[PDB]
Enzyme design. Sequence first.
Site, mmCIF file in Angstrom:
data_model
loop_
_atom_site.group_PDB
_atom_site.id
_atom_site.type_symbol
_atom_site.label_atom_id
_atom_site.label_comp_id
_atom_site.label_asym_id
_atom_site.label_seq_id
_atom_site.Cartn_x
_atom_site.Cartn_y
_atom_site.Cartn_z
ATOM 1 N N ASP A 35 0.856 -1.196 0.000
ATOM 2 C CA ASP A 35 0.000 0.000 0.000
ATOM 3 C C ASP A 35 0.882 1.234 0.000
ATOM 4 O O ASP A 35 1.380 1.658 1.065
ATOM 5 C CB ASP A 35 -0.868 -0.045 1.245
ATOM 6 N N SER A 199 -0.098 15.352 -12.310
ATOM 7 C CA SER A 199 -0.251 14.956 -13.704
ATOM 8 C C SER A 199 -0.468 16.187 -14.567
ATOM 9 O O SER A 199 -1.041 17.160 -14.067
ATOM 10 C CB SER A 199 -1.431 14.012 -13.812
HETATM 11 C C1 LIG Z 1 -5.115 -1.282 1.277
HETATM 12 C C2 LIG Z 1 -6.524 -1.310 1.798
HETATM 13 C C3 LIG Z 1 -7.181 -2.494 2.103
HETATM 14 C C4 LIG Z 1 -8.480 -2.393 2.611
HETATM 15 N N1 LIG Z 1 -9.177 -3.508 2.943
HETATM 16 C C5 LIG Z 1 -10.525 -3.443 3.456
HETATM 17 C C6 LIG Z 1 -11.528 -3.551 2.344
HETATM 18 C C7 LIG Z 1 -12.055 -2.439 1.716
HETATM 19 C C8 LIG Z 1 -12.949 -2.591 0.673
HETATM 20 C C9 LIG Z 1 -13.314 -3.868 0.312
HETATM 21 N N2 LIG Z 1 -12.844 -4.959 0.909
HETATM 22 C C10 LIG Z 1 -11.949 -4.783 1.889
HETATM 23 N N3 LIG Z 1 -9.090 -1.218 2.806
HETATM 24 C C11 LIG Z 1 -8.371 -0.120 2.475
HETATM 25 N N4 LIG Z 1 -8.968 1.078 2.646
HETATM 26 N N5 LIG Z 1 -7.114 -0.121 1.976
#
Ligand SMILES: Cc1cc(NCc2cccnc2)nc(N)n1
Length: 330
Positions: A35, A199
């Site tokens: 991330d 951008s």
């Molecule tokens: C990198 C990341 C993962 C995450 N997982 C949870 C999630 C969100 C939406 C659908 N299913 C699971 N939520 C976020 N905001 N960032």
Amino acid sequence: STGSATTTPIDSLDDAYITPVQIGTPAQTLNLDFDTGSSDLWVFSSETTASEVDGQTIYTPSKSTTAKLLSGATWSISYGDGSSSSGDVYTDTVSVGGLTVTGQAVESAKKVSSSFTEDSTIDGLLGLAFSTLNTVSPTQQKTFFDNAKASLDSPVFTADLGYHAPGTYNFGFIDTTAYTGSITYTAVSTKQGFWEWTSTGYAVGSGTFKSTSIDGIADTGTTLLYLPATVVSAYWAQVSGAKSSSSVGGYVFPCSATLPSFTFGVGSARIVIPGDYIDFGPISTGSSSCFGGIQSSAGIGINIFGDVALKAAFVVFNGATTPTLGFASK
Ligand SMILES: Cc1cc(NCc2cccnc2)nc(N)n1
Ligand SMILES: Cc1cc(NCc2cccnc2)nc(N)n1
Ligand SMILES: Cc1cc(NCc2cccnc2)nc(N)n1
């Protein structure tokens, strides 16, 4: 040193990507969502509330000879979408793709939101934004990349996400075989802790390129491309029957459509997102309404170049003293 790890989409529509990470001694391999929009490395663990674990692999610090409680430390993160997690912290040895960091903060979840729990394929997060966003208190912790940086051959990592296919995260080197043409580098602001850049504009399909500055972040954590409402309306106006649905929460298009490409500028260079990349499938099983991959940022407060955009490019996250981003076609 360098590292190289394959990242694999969790499902047929690239809703997220997972990368195997070795934690502890002996290694416990967990599949983490890398991330670039957050700065915490957190995992499902033996401490996670049992009702909040549904198929994830867990980290068990008591089984790691190198784990140590970071005493007193806690963490808590709320992501933009209302997804959350929190817990305590261990230090341990973490390896990605052969690159090892000792003393990495591994944030052990005690609590996760249902969105995390239901995502059975994702065992945690590995944040790659700037360490100024790390949520550990009272002693903020460094990301895996910040801890690795001094050891790396070059202070970089690269994201090469696949379309409906695996891709690669490399650390410490730029694989000159992984892209075509040249890499165009662009300035980064770290003021908000993100890989924030500007951008130079966009085009819709075969249309003229509109020169216009669009600030946003390069965020592997975010699945879609979030842009200003003017740009997004201009895109979806080219798709017969596309509309913004309050009931769905954003743009859907007929599943009978052929989507146009979307081009974004990186300095004088252009990255083309094929139309297929912007098709995130039926809004529910059997529906003839499909979920758009380009959405408005207007209810976020930041533009987000998420996976839909990043997967069209070979992306260099240059963590030199003056950070920069690089984009190449591939
Ligand atoms: C990198 C990341 C993962 C995450 N997982 C949870 C999630 C969100 C939406 C659908 N299913 C699971 N939520 C976020 N905001 N960032
Ligand atoms: C981390 C992650 C993101 C994601 N994005 C697509 C998504 C978000 C919200 C509703 N429907 C689909 N889906 C999953 N499973 N995990
Ligand atoms: C990714 C995706 C799926 C989809 N499903 C709906 C569908 C198509 C064909 C036959 N039966 C149902 N339509 C589109 N356009 N994209």
